[PDB]
Design an enzyme around this catalytic site. Structure first.
Site, short mmCIF file in Angstrom:
data_model
loop_
_atom_site.label_atom_id
_atom_site.label_comp_id
_atom_site.label_asym_id
_atom_site.label_seq_id
_atom_site.Cartn_x
_atom_site.Cartn_y
_atom_site.Cartn_z
N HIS A 41 52.57 37.96 50.00
CA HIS A 41 51.45 36.25 50.38
C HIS A 41 51.56 35.48 49.53
CE1 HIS A 41 48.94 39.00 47.01
NE2 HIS A 41 49.14 37.33 46.77
N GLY A 143 46.22 34.08 40.50
CA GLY A 143 47.33 33.50 39.24
C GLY A 143 48.07 35.24 39.40
N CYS A 145 48.71 37.95 40.92
CA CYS A 145 49.10 38.90 41.70
C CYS A 145 51.19 39.38 41.34
CB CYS A 145 49.05 38.11 43.18
SG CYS A 145 47.66 38.19 44.05
#
Ligand SMILES: O=C1N[C@]2(CCOc3ccc(Cl)cc32)C(=O)N1c1cncc2ccccc12
Ligand SMILES: O=C1N[C@]2(CCOc3ccc(Cl)cc32)C(=O)N1c1cncc2ccccc12
Lengths: 304, 304
Positions: A41, A143, A145
């Site tokens: 993503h 942030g 991830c």
């Protein structure tokens, strides 16, 4: 003496953390050898997250659209590929700090350490468990991830988790290092409910053994039970069913304390049925289920 | 979202851990520049610990009696000195992994990360607080002495604690990096009682703010209180007295949540007076006091 929610030393994993930027999205990557692993993503805008077609979105991306930064220096991306829900970015430089490593897919109830990162920089380390509903109760802001979960066996880092998502309920979802989500979660901004968060019975028992080892014995009673009788009570309290495998796995703690597993089960049964009555066990007022039997043996024996 | 007892990444401190052996005693050392810091009780036998005269015991020791090992290689000791309860071993090689560092003496209520070590090898990392009675509720086995407590400010490691002792009560005692014990503890195997372990009121309040930020709001009430009225209740429950400095320090959390400090105090007052009633706050059934206001701001904002 003393029992703490202990995480593995994070140095070996810190040496792998990089920042991956694609368009306006920046998240973390894990650099092992000449490949950087990150959530797919990263190629999405916030509008894309509603209904992304990752294959089509990826077509509009070339090697040069993935900006990989390790510390303060930029890595050259010479290849890219999608493997399930992760992107693998081939870089021209092998990570000189690559430790010995494995990619493992853990089972629910198993614990691991998370190194929470932002912009490829480590901010903190904590211990958590893969819940029976395949979520993790982490601590992640936007942030985070691409932050990873791992276990260490002497010098080998077994990477088991990569952070991808936060559900509307404040719990977290993610994948193994092959990009497969734990549980039924998908990398979409859509309604996803976690499932019943049951208690990891074998871990609670392990932690009761840890309390006996460290002196908290008030909860030890004069009773015993059977696996079937204990499981009747465990079901009522949304506890995972205890199997003979779990009893076997608790054998070394049972041997160290001289308390048979089924006797500890009857103590747990009385604790579920009567509560703590304002008392604590290892400085906790609830039954802790995020220490496996292996974690208790490790902590109580000092494995480095 | 999510709130976890988070420790600082330990890599920078792992690069400093060495093993120090003197006679038959082996404990941990911290190698910064060309000096290795360790507990002076490394020169003691178990018989010596009853009534040691460290100066006399040290006379019978030369540079070559201190065996310092970093990883698998031996460091050459070119000097030794006693500074309060620590030994400083001058080695001929500067630690190539010495981070930017400071030695700080923390106040009670302040939190820090501990990297538990055995034979100069890191085994785990956890977060703890310096209790108001100057003990720490750690997790340390025999051989853990010389393990350090630290905080990190971006790239600067502030070393605040070195492990020395476990009291008969299972709590831990240690020094700052200048060898001065926190509290009235002495490096002797003698009867030492810790003192009242009071609750760190400002940290509990900070953690209540963290719960509001993360959605746990059930405990918020329609009441307010004054510093004096709250302190009357705090004394009764063995809570540290709340000062205007504490109120000021909670200002940024108060601003973020829109909940005045004294309103949060009245919520805490009702929680002390009426209990949790079987409920939890941030997955905990007791009031957590090992997160400072700075830790909550840091965790909830993602400082790396
Ligand atoms: O960065 C992202 N993007 C999100 C945004 C929502 O839509 C989705 C849907 C699917 C996936 Cl894979 C990710 C995302 C997501 O959850 N996170 C975050 C991860 N963890 C914690 C967060 C704390 C606050 C804010 C966002 C957090
Ligand atoms: O290694 C040492 N030596 C001790 C032994 C007791 O007499 C003293 C007296 C003073 C001092 Cl400074 C240290 C010591 C001590 O507490 N520890 C230990 C530290 N921490 C945890 C321990 C867990 C089990 C066993 C010993 C542990």
């Amino acid at each position: 003496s003393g029992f703490r929610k202990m995480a593995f030393p994070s140095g070996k994993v810190e040496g792998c953390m990089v920042q991956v930027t694609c368009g306006t999205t920046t998240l973390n990557g894990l650099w092992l050898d000449d490949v950087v692993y990150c959530p797919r993503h990263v190629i999405c805008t916030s509008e894309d997250m509603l209904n992304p077609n990752y294959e089509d979105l990826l077509i509009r991306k070339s090697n040069h659209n993935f900006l990989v930064q390790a510390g303060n220096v930029q890595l050259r991306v010479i290849g890219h590929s999608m493997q399930n829900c992760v992107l693998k970015l081939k870089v021209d430089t092998a990570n000189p700090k690559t430790p010995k490593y494995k990619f493992v897919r853990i089972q629910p109830g198993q614990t691991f350490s998370v190194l929470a990162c932002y912009n490829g920089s480590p901010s903190g380390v904590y211990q958590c468990a893969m819940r029976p509903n395949f979520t993790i109760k982490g601590s992640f802001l936007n942030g985070s991830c691409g932050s990873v979960g791992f276990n260490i066996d002497y010098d080998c880092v077994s990477f088991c988790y990569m952070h991808h998502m936060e559900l509307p309920t404040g719990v977290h979802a993610g994948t193994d290092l092959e990009g497969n989500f734990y549980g039924p979660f998908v990398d979409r901004q859509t309604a996803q409910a976690a499932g019943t968060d049951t208690t990891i019975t074998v871990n609670v028992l392990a932690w009761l053994y840890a309390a006996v080892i460290n002196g908290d014995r008030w909860f030890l009673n004069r009773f015993t039970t059977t696996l079937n009788d204990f499981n009747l009570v465990a079901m009522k309290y949304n506890y995972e069913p205890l199997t003979q495998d779990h009893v076997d796995i608790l054998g070394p703690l049972s041997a160290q304390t001289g308390i048979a597993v089924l006797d500890m089960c009857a103590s747990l049964k009385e604790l579920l049925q009567n509560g703590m009555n304002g008392r604590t066990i290892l400085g906790s007022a609830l039954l802790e289920d995020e220490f496996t039997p292996f974690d208790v043996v490790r902590q109580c024996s000092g494995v480095t």
